[PDB]
């Protein structure tokens, strides 16, 4: 349950600039280590370039999990993407290659969410030569404990998907002003897919994320839902909680608007620098 989770306790941060510090520190430690290993050398990635590669490899994780046979449930994909985010919070993309950690994240997520895929079924989803699938499997298993150590052994991930279903039940039963809340579902799922690309999953509760997605679908539909917040969720009695909640949903929507995708020609250069840094690791 989220309200006493390791996720709440350790992996939900106060601001986007706290995340920036963690990542800047991880980038810095790789440089500091590599220079102590034999200092402002252009072979290194800057933290914003690591961020672009993390955004790019998040997207490839999404596509890997999308095409995955047998069909990978949405909570495994969400758990994998959360691990990928959490790994590269305290770790450099220059130390551990995101293409391997992407797959290790997916592989660990399959195990943690009881999606009992066999290792041969797993690496059979890599569009690679079978020698490369077996090589990729060795790397996946080699990095697996490293992932778990870098997650601080906090393996359960609370995704917005189940809270989203809970709000869609609650809307139907308690909020008859919104007749047919399932009109919100597609456009709320669209927002949920957008907010997953941002740092929101490290900043907000999965209930806040799910509510934001629902209310943003409703505002996009011309439906006011302030009466759901005030009357149904009882926030008429605690205006100081209504304010906080509306602030959270506002900041989360602004955090989607300020999202810029990893640009294809930017990434094409950063991948070569990433590869050069891995060749000269």
């Amino acid at each position: 349950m989220y309200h006493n989770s390791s996720q709440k306790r350790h992996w939900t941060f106060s601001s986007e600039e706290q995340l920036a510090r963690l990542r800047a520190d991880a980038n810095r430690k790789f440089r500091c280590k590599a220079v102590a290993n034999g200092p402002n050398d252009p072979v290194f990635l800057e933290p914003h370039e690591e961020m672009t590669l993390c955004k790019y490899y998040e997207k490839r994780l999404l596509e890997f999990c999308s095409v995955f046979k047998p069909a990978m449930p949405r909570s495994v994909v969400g758990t994998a993407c959360m691990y990928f985010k959490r790994f590269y919070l305290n770790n450099s993309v220059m130390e551990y290659h995101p293409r391997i950690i992407m797959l290790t994240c997916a592989f660990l997520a399959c195990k943690v969410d009881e999606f009992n895929v066999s290792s041969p079924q797993f690496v059979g989803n890599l569009r690679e030569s079978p020698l490369g699938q077996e090589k990729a499997l060795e790397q996946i298993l080699e990095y697996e404990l490293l992932l778990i150590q870098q997650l601080n052994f906090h393996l359960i991930v609370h995704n917005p998907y189940r809270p989203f279903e809970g709000f869609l039940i609650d809307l139907k039963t308690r909020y008859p002003i919104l007749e047919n809340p399932e009109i919100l579902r597609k456009t709320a799922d669209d927002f949920l897919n957008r907010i997953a690309l941002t740092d929101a999953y490290l900043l907000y509760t999965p209930s806040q994320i799910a509510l934001t997605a629902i209310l943003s679908s409703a505002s996009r539909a011309g439906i006011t839902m302030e009466s759901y917040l005030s009357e149904s969720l009882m926030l008429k009695e605690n205006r100081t909680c209504l304010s906080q909640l509306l602030d959270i949903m506002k900041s989360m929507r602004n955090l989607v608007k300020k999202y810029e995708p990893p640009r294809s020609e930017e990434v094409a250069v950063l991948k070569q620098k990433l590869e050069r840094c891995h060749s000269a690791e």
Partner: protein, 297 residues
Amino acid sequence: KRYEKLDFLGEGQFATVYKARDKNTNQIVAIKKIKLAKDGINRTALREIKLLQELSHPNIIGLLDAFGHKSNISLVFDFMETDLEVIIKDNSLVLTPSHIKAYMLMTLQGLEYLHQHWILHRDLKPNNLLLDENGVLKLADFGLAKSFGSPNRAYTHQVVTRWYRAPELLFGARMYGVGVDMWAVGCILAELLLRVPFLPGDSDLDQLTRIFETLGTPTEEQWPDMCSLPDYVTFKSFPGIPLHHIFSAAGDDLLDLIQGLFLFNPCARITATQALKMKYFSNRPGPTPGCQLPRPN
């Protein structure tokens, strides 16, 4: 790696367990070092890691730390001196009604918390009810424990040790809830009272025979939809033995608890919450303090 290995505490399928001293504090801990090809880290270890990181209750085993090397992970726990199986089998210990009340109370508290966090222990038996030196019972061995309440997942039915396995699992339920742990608490309570395995069936069909012979063959009035279960086979109509002829020393309060735990219908079978609210716990005598629970020495 802050852990000096004292003693060897046991081996099982996935792990060897050792008593260790934590050098950083001089706490005695049990390190469960996981044993091993091309599957990576063992799922039973990851199941125990993932679930016990999210639970914090006096009567559930604390995962104090975890660490490892290349696919050989090791999990550090609270050191427990004994289990309820050792108490049950130790013919020198008297299990008074207050001792049985205390053991049941702590089990149901741990199980209430666990069920409130939507986890089934799914392997409850006297081995897995460990006792610390202060006489606090903890649920342990989370190797089969699973999150429940999600329809989008099927669960296996071969997932409590046979003698503590609920009739819905023996009839092959792939969807179930707290009834699979609450039956096993029944079986443990029965074994606390009798000092012997209550329903010691040799096979799954023999387990069903033992259950129905003891508690009566369920009617479709007792357990609606029973016939729908995948591995349902009809049995001879056993009358069952009245619970006061089984539990000759049980008061009517305790018999109501036992009866609620042993209802065939897993929906009607009492939850840990409603078990704890029963007059059995509220009545005299009080449950013994942990410091006064019988210590197999």
